[PDB]
Design a protein around this ligand. Structure first.
Ligand SMILES: Cc1ccc(N)c(=O)n1C
Length: 119
């Protein structure tokens, strides 16, 4: 029932994601010199360094907000990919599966703690 525990749990999950080779294309904003048409397709860029910085600045109120930004990294990859078989997109799918597997208990524990707080 710790309402604040999600923050360190998210920091540790982000550390695991940064150790994972599949996260390398997503660690920093997409380079517009490498992908000149990126902003013609993607309206809201997102990357793991921005998520980590937002968390560390105390600019997420809940793990749901962090989860919305991480999911945006994956939906941007899906929207920008020229093929469902592309290398970078395929890395995004594995990383998404790993993230969802680990964020599930973070979200459940937070929501349960908040329900207990408001009982
Ligand atoms: C093609 C591509 C390039 C760079 C990215 N970060 C990405 O998500 N895709 C899908």
């Amino acid at each position: 029932y710790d309402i604040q525990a999600w923050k360190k749990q998210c920091e540790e999950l982000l550390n695991l994601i940064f150790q994972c080779e599949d996260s390398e294309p997503f660690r920093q904003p997409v380079d517009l010199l490498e992908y000149p048409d990126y902003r013609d397709i993607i309206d809201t860029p997102m990357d793991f360094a921005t998520v980590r910085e937002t968390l560390e600045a105390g600019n997420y109120e809940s793990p749901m907000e962090l989860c919305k930004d991480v999911r945006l990294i994956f939906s941007n990859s899906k929207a920008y990919t020229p093929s469902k078989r592309s290398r970078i997109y395929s890395m995004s799918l594995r990383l998404s599966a790993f993230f969802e597997e680990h964020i599930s208990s973070v979200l459940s524990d937070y929501k349960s703690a908040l329900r207990f707080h408001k009982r």
